[PDB]
Amino acid sequence: ARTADFRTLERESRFINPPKDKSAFPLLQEAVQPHIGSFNALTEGPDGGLLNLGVKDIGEKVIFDGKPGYLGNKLSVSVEQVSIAKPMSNDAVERKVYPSESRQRLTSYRGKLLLKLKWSVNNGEENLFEVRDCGGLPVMLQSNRCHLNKMSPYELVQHKEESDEIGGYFIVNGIEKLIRMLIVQRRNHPMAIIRPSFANRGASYSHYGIQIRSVRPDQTSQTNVLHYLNDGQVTFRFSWRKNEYLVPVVMILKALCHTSDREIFDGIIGNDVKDSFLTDRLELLLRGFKKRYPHLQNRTQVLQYLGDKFRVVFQASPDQSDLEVGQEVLDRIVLVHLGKDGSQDKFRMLLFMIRKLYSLVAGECSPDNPDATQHQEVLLGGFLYGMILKEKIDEYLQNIIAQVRMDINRGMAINFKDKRYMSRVLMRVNENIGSKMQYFLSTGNLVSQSGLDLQQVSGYTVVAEKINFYRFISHFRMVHRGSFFAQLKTTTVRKLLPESWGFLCPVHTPDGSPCGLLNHFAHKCRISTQQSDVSRIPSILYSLGVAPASHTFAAGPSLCCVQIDGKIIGWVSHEQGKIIADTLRYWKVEGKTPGLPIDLEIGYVPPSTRGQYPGLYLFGGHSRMLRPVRYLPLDKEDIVGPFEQVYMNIAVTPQEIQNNVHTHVEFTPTNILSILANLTPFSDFNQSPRNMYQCQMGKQTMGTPGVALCHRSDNKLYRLQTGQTPIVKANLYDDYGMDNFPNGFNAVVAVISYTGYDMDDAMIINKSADERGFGYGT
Amino acid sequence: SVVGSLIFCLDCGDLLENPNAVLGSNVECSQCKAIYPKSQFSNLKVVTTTADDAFPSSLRAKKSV
Amino acid sequence: MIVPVRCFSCGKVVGDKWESYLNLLQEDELDEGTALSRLGLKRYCCRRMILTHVDLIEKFLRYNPLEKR
Amino acid sequence: LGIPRLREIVMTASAAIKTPQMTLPIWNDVSDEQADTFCKSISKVLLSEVIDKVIVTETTGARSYVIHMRFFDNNEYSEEYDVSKEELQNVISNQFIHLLEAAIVKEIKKQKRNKVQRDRQSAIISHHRFITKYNFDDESGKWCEFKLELAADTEKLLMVNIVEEICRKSIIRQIPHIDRCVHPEPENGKRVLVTEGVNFQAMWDQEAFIDVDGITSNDVAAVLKTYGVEAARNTIVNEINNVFSRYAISVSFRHLDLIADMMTRQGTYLAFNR
Amino acid sequence: LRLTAEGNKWRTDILKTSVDTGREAAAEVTNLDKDTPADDPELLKRLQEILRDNNKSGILDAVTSSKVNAITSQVVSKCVPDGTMKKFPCNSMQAMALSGAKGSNVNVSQIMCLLGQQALEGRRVPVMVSGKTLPSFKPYETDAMAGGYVKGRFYSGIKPQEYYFHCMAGREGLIDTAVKTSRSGYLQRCLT
Amino acid sequence: SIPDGFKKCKHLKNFPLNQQVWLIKFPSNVDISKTTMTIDKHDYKIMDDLSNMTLLVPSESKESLKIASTAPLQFDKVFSVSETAKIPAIDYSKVRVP
Amino acid sequence: SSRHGQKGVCSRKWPTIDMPFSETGIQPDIIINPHAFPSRMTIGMFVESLAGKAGAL
Amino acid sequence: EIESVQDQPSVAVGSFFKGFRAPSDTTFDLYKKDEFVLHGENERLEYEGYTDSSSQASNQYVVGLFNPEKKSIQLYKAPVLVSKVVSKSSKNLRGPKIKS
RNA sequence: AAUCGAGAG
DNA sequence: ATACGCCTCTCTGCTTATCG
DNA sequence: CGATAAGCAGATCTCTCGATTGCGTAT
Ligand SMILES: [Zn+2]
Ligand SMILES: [Zn+2]
Known part of the structure; x- marks a missing residue:
């Protein structure tokens, strides 16, 4: 047997004739699967696509003319269907355009964006529909809206791209750009937080809190913060238009669903009636509300107060009743991951969050670390593209209403039923949504009325520079903590935590300023780009023994709280919850039960002494980080996430599997490293800073960018003339097809102190070898 | 109804008013518009104890280990 | 890209042996060491030059700006 | 240590030194047991460091509190802290209840937006605002229960968080600007005694245990206050030098002396900044 | 870089003595009776209290670090230079470590005998909220390898968990050097 | 108001009580027509679950519901039936390999 | 750089005659x-x- | 052993709140569509109640009397209703549609 | 000229 | 096609206030 | 007058590259 093979004949045959079915390197495509899948999820998939859901939740914005209790004629402009075309050209009958032409022309590779407006009048009296082109929207290569989507390597070569061209990037002004993946708080999970900044937020502020980052079905997010004041009252927080507002928690608790106060007492305090801490804090809260707001005795009155309080900041229409605008803000701010028609579930989740806040302030649960990988997810970049597009079409829909308002206030008459008037106004506004998206790609700046729940503004897209193929493939696996942490002094954010085992590469990190903040995924790490079928999971859970969350009336860490994506499914004892988690894992790994997708991340937190807040947490959404691992019972592949991993024992190799201690084992230890960190020979014999230096330096080598260089017009390109394959190489050198892109040369190296001209770090090159073309490049 | 220092109506489940906070012999439910008497609510007692993480000291460390 | 004319270290002409190496690998069922020895490459400096050549010229040649594709 | 210390010394000249310290030489005729006794006598003890638990029994039968303060056993705290039943009872009678009532009345203001025992209880009631009972275990030093009656307009208070805050912030026996006095292992022969604070005049009295002529401190501003410019210059040199001693970096004393004489050129502690 | 057969024998014999050092350190920090089993409920409870409480965790880390450093010192003294097949002045690694041309006895020791305990700031490796220091190790494991004590050397290579801990320490060093060079210069500017 | 499709049951059935009141909860895979027992060759875990579950029993009218009081009338014991599975003990002689 | x-x-292009040579001739x-x-x-x-020497041999 | 199991609606269980007591003058009226609605009233109260649609399709509840001497245990079926009790004087209070 | 991004010691 | 005005996570030291 | 609780200010090596830089409007 031979440990490795050069595969010379196979490689040369494949060079001669590119495959006509599929590329021979499947792993080289799963590397860019996050970016491609994120851009794909906004046009295809269930529910019509992310852009369609985004327009649906943008809804209608109305205005009144004022012409003669009767506010005038109502105009409600909106969009209900958005489509992107694969890029065409008129050079009549159009012809397909491929990115080679965009590269050669030094221009962008963009497809036309079409929105069909709804010019509704008088709530359905008559509707004027007209599709409007809104500029050429840039699209990423190898996506379902790109013309290379299904081509074989043979067809890719015929269309001048590459033998194994990968997408995941855009082309703007003849320059390739990539939306970096950012790592943000885990969605739809309330995590206890201790922050001295919360105390700084004013006076009577503790440092405790409960922060949940709810995500809408169209992948937009809303952060709700549940502060605790030292007196005893709990404060709700949210941000709407780059400003921040505060609300008593009891206001929202009563506004959500028609409920009593004994129900709030039972929801926050379960069977723990004898718990003086909880009872006294809750009495303080209830009496503080009944003192401050004695004229809000029912849900309708509370909603009307909220509506009166929120008029000019929410751009509520003159027709909107106070009750309905209060319902609008309640459905548009509070726990948006449950969406509308989920007031009861939002009520349960707020009660759970309040009890968790009281546990955090009583020191019965430890604070959840927000910078630990256990409590994080990835913002894919295609999702950010969809969110920015939704914000831009919202701005457009508001700008056309601004135009008609300016017409109204300039003294000109109108007719909302007139297609001529609709045409006249639609040509006085800005419809280069595509040009604004191109601006975002070409600068990185995020021009926004809402910060999209994100912290930074600039620094969102980097050029996918192609010095070298390691550099190029590294662009598509780098994840950033955010530019806020770039200028800081808390070194603890850069620490290599054990919570990233198998998700973040321990080695691949740039040295210097971006050390610790710029990370790379382990090469077998996968970021999900779709929601797993979870409709049947609550049904299976009730059969397993989960008592339903509607008629059980339990609360506290004394019981396990079963949740699914932030929705309290039911309550169960801790032992039975452990059994439920084990049985769910078994049924999920064995592919018999149709209601348990293998991507399901059953993150179970056992009871402990002042540890993390317990309960059984189930996740199946987008943006999760998942890695394969061998489930030991029935010996099949399993999928785990960072949240689930910090509690499960996973033997690194099968030799040290212990009795009744391990339920998992890695497929191989080498799948906790990046591609670059796997390509280092005998990495486990060097000092780790030298492995980090190698990851940094292998992206800077004058290797081979690609083979279609006669069809590119890049600003600067470095090409090694004659590369060679390594004699000593990892088994994954072939799996990613790195032989297609040679990076160096096998050299005869004498470790000798002979010359005198190489002492500190210099090295000597043979003159004759140099004259024979050793290490030549252009 | 009565839980420590808290009393809830048995009809609408609304928190009442504390007895010694309003006009005499009549504590009124703000939802049910019912009338409750100051009787049978003799002592709303709550017994609390300190956190046991509240007083870090040299002697407290020696208490356990 | 294309086979080097000479070995880098010693200078032995190894540019006329790449096609023969492929022939001996394909037609004959020879392992790489046997094929390199039968080509006359004894020093490992000369053996590496052929054993590790990639031959990217073939992949470069598929992008021909002078013939219709 | 290190560069933060250099910032404190030469960059900031902070009179508010982060860790003030005094090195107290001991006379050669003072044994280790007396050294520890002096350390515990000097070191401060807060009320929180002697209390095991506190029980607050609110009753609405007008609203009253029964605050019971459970102490560590006498054979424990009178040994570890040099604190007696009498000293504890005096502290609770004088400072604790006054601070507690001050906190309570401030809280309400924010909300509006054996005949010896009998006579002691009567005196405590008369002097204090709204206390109605008081009994201290004068035979075991084990507990202290005192009632506290508020009005009927008063809203509910936790009465445990304020009690904890008062119990922490109330001292028992503290010398100003001094927290702890630890007796480390003697090094290079001489036996030292380092406190976690600077109060030169407090140990000026303790001629018996402390060689006052050799009390060398860490805070440059304090020694400038009490001893003068030149002692400040000496301690500047010493503090700017012993930072380099742990890092084993040899810097000549001419540089440090020139920097010290530039920093004390006006007779004060001038920093190197604007 | 190699040792003798007798040198390797001494190295492995002294390293076998490092099996119970972590368990003894835990039993003595937790004040439990020595020779108590590693799966004792009281030991696990006290280790959990120590995990929650930062100062107690630091005490445990420092005590166990001292014990494993003693084991490392024993290994190095027993195996260098008396356990090395090629000896000074022929042994060039040892030669230039002794001579001051480059390197030190610590580097030679890590290449030939033992990398030893990996120290993060001034403590052992970070622990999760479940008491696990890595997915492989069971919660509250009183094993020196679990705490970052790597018995491997750069000649025979280090295991995956040891590789992970060593990467932690190396990243910490690379961060600390940047912080230090950033902070050095303002002092000199203001003084000058 | 009455939501569409809802039709009020008018004639109810008797309840022979003057005996212990029990509550038992079954899953959706248990045929109710027919502490770890076997039902239809299946494995079911059974355990037990300031009250909220009141008892509504028809009065002597067979047309409405009332709250018994012999202050509600609470069930003497609440049971639960749970679906389970057998977790296979790992055979170490295979996976444990040098 | 190596991997x-x-x-x-590169500090000097050493002429091949001045380079050290082995018993093999390379x-x-x-x-x-x-x-280093x-x-x-x-x-x-x-x-x-x-390993590279062994593989090339 | 199990002798008779009832399917026709006989009894039901509700979740009003902790320690709920109701006067003897009040009654309840059921509705079946399986989704259920319950309704009751008195002078200043309303016993409205619905059920969780997503849960009733999975969890089923059984009631029954037991015989200490015999074996013919009794069995029954009873759905669960999650009820929200409402007042009457605090139901229909509103304000202006928009405050100027 | 700024701003952003990538680097080197 | 085009020419005027519009677009959220550190630190010491100086200085004023303000209330019994 | 004065002693904090509070508010406000100005700080926190050298070198090489590339890419972009502003939108609405009234006539
Ligand atoms: Zn009532
Ligand atoms: Zn040669």
């Missing part, structure tokens, strides 16, 4: 000082030279 973070600038095309290793501790480069 072990052993970066260094003259190395790269010379790296032995002092004791502090960097890149034993992977040593074992890679070993």
